[PDB]
C-alpha cells in the first residue's frame, strides 16, 4: 500500500536544524525523489550563514524510502511500508579520532511532499580538526548499508561506516549506527538481512552565492537471495588462496595502475587493501595537488606512494613486506563518483 | 606479469580424521590422501546433497540431525563465518 505513493517523480523538503560545539545552524532542501529509479535530485542551503561543518558530514543525515527495491525484494522495504504515517530514524555518527553526532529525524508526507524534519547535536569537535577545520574534500563514496530486522521496536537496525577523504590523502571514517521506528500503529514490513548500495554526486549551483550542496544520489538495494553453492565457494578460495604476488618476508614490491579517462594529478589518489577475513582499510594517500601524502599506521615508515603525470600512472613502494600485509590491494579516486582500480593479490610468505 | 620458473607444489595434502573420512565417502570420495580444496568440494558437495542448507537463508547450514553436527560439534552454522568453519575443518584432519 505504501509503496504506491512512490511510483513516479515526489517532491521532496528537507529540515535540519544542528548545533554541533555550540555553534548552529540550519538547512533547508527541495527536489525530487523517484524511488522507481532510486534517483535523489536535491538542492540544499544553509539558511543561518554558512556551514561550520562540512557538507559530506551531513550528507548521511540530509530519506532511504526513495531506494530503489527491485520486484522480488519488495516485501523488504521498511521505509515505504510505514508511509504515509512516517517512521522515526535516530542515528549515531561517530567521527574516529575526533566528535560524535547525534540526530533524530521524522520522515513522513505532508500533503503529498515526502518530508524530513531532523534535529542534530554535536559533541567532542577539535577546534583545529578535520570537521570544523573543514579539512574534507568536497565528495561522497559509495557505500553499503547493511540493514537487519529489529522486532521489538518493529522497525530495523542498521551498521556503517562513511569514508571521508581528507585532503591529506587520509580517509576519515564516520561509524553509523541507526535505528528506524514507524509512527502509525499500522502494519509495517520487517526485512530479511540485506544492504542498500548507494552513490552520491556532490556538486555546486553558479548562479546561487549562499553556501549550498546540489546533491545527486543513487540508491539500490540487494542481499537476501545468495545461493549456498556460492557462499560455499567464497569461504573455500577463502581458505585456498593461492596468491598472485607472492614474497618473502622482508622483501619489496612495486604496485603500478594505470588511469583511464581522468587526469590523475588532478584528483587525489589513494590505496586500499582486504585482508582474508578483514574489511578493506584506507593504506595511503596523496592530495591532488601532490603536497601531502598520507599513510596509515601500520604502513608508516615502509610505503611511498607517487604518481607520473605523463603516464598518468599511480605507484605504491612497498618495503620490509610483513606477512600482515598480505592482502587484495586496490586504487581509489573520486571524481564526483567513487571508482576503484582492479584488485591486486600480494601474498607474502 | 613476471611469473617465477619453477612453480612451486603449494597444494596442502591431509588426511582426514575417521569421521570427517566417513562423510567424503558417503557423496562418492575414494580416497584417504586428499588436498585441501578437494576436501572442501566433496563436504559443500555434501551439505547440498543431504540439503542441509536453509532454503530462505542460504548461508544456515542445520546439522543438529546429521553426522556434520558431529564432525564440527554445533547444531547449525553460518558458512558466512569463515574463521570458525576452517577451524572445525582443521580439528578432523592432519597435514600430510
Known amino acids: 500500500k505504501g509503496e504506491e505513493l512512490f511510483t513516479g517523480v515526489v517532491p521532496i523538503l528537507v529540515e535540519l536544524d544542528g548545533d554541533v560545539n555550540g555553534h548552529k545552524f540550519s538547512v533547508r532542501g527541495e527536489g525530487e525523489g523517484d524511488a522507481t529509479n532510486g534517483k535523489l535530485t536535491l538542492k540544499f542551503i544553509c539558511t543561518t550563514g554558512k556551514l561550520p561543518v562540512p557538507w559530506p558530514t551531513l550528507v548521511t543525515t540530509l530519506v532511504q524510502c526513495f531506494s530503489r527495491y527491485p520486484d522480488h525484494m519488495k516485501r523488504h522495504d521498511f521505509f515505504k511500508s510505514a508511509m504515509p504515517e512516517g517512521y522515526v530514524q535516530e542515528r549515531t555518527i561517530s567521527f574516529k579520532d575526533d566528535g560524535t553526532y547525534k540526530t533524530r529525524a521524522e520522515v513522513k508526507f505532508e500533503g503529498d511532499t515526502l518530508v524530513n524534519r531532523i534535529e542534530l547535536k554535536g559533541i567532542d569537535f577539535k577546534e583545529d580538526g578535520n570537521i570544523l577545520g573543514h579539512k574534507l574534500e568536497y565528495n561522497f563514496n559509495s557505500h553499503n548499508v547493511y540493514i537487519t530486522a529489529d522486532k521489538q521496536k518493529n522497525g530495523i537496525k542498521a551498521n556503517f561506516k562513511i569514508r571521508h577523504n581528507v585532503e591529506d590523502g587520509s580517509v576519515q571514517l564516520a561509524d553509523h549506527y541507526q535505528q528506524n521506528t514507524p509512527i502509525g500503529d499500522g502494519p509495517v514490513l520487517l526485512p530479511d538481512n540485506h544492504y542498500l548500495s548507494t552513490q552520491s554526486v556532490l556538486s555546486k549551483d553558479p548562479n546561487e552565492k549562499r553556501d549550498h550542496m546540489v546533491l545527486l544520489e543513487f540508491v539500490t538495494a540487494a542481499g537476501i537471495t545468495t545461493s549456498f553453492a556460492e557462499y560455499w565457494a567464497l569461504l573455500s578460495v577463502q581458505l585456498v588462496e593461492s596468491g598472485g604476488a607472492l614474497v618473502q618476508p622482508g622483501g619489496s614490491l612495486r604496485l603500478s595502475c594505470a588511469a583511464s579517462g581522468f587526469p590523475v594529478n588532478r584528483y587525489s589518489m589513494r590505496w586500499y587493501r582486504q585482508a582474508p577475513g578483514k574489511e578493506r582499510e584506507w593504506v595511503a594517500g596523496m592530495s591532488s595537488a601532490g603536497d601531502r601524502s598520507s599513510y596509515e599506521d601500520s604502513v608508516k615508515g615502509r610505503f611511498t606512494i607517487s604518481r607520473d603525470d605523463a603516464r598518468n600512472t599511480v605507484y605504491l613502494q612497498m618495503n620490509s613486506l610483513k606477512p600482515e600485509d598480505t592482502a587484495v590491494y586496490y586504487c581509489?579516486?573520486?571524481?564526483?563518483?567513487?571508482?576503484w582500480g582492479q584488485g591486486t593479490q600480494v601474498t607474502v610468505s | 606479469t613476471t611469473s617465477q620458473i619453477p612453480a612451486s607444489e603449494q597444494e596442502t595434502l591431509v588426511r582426514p580424521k575417521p569421521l570427517l573420512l566417513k562423510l567424503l565417502k558417503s557423496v562418492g570420495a575414494q580416497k584417504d590422501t586428499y588436498t585441501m580444496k578437494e576436501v572442501l568440494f566433496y563436504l559443500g558437495q555434501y551439505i547440498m546433497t543431504k540439503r542441509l542448507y536453509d532454503e530462505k537463508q542460504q548461508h544456515i547450514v542445520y546439522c543438529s540431525n546429521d553426522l556434520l553436527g558431529d564432525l564440527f560439534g554445533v547444531p547449525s552454522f553460518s558458512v558466512k563465518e569463515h574463521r570458525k568453519i576452517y577451524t572445525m575443518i582443521y580439528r578432523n584432519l592432519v597435514v600430510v
Open positions: 581509489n579516486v573520486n571524481v564526483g563518483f567513487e571508482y
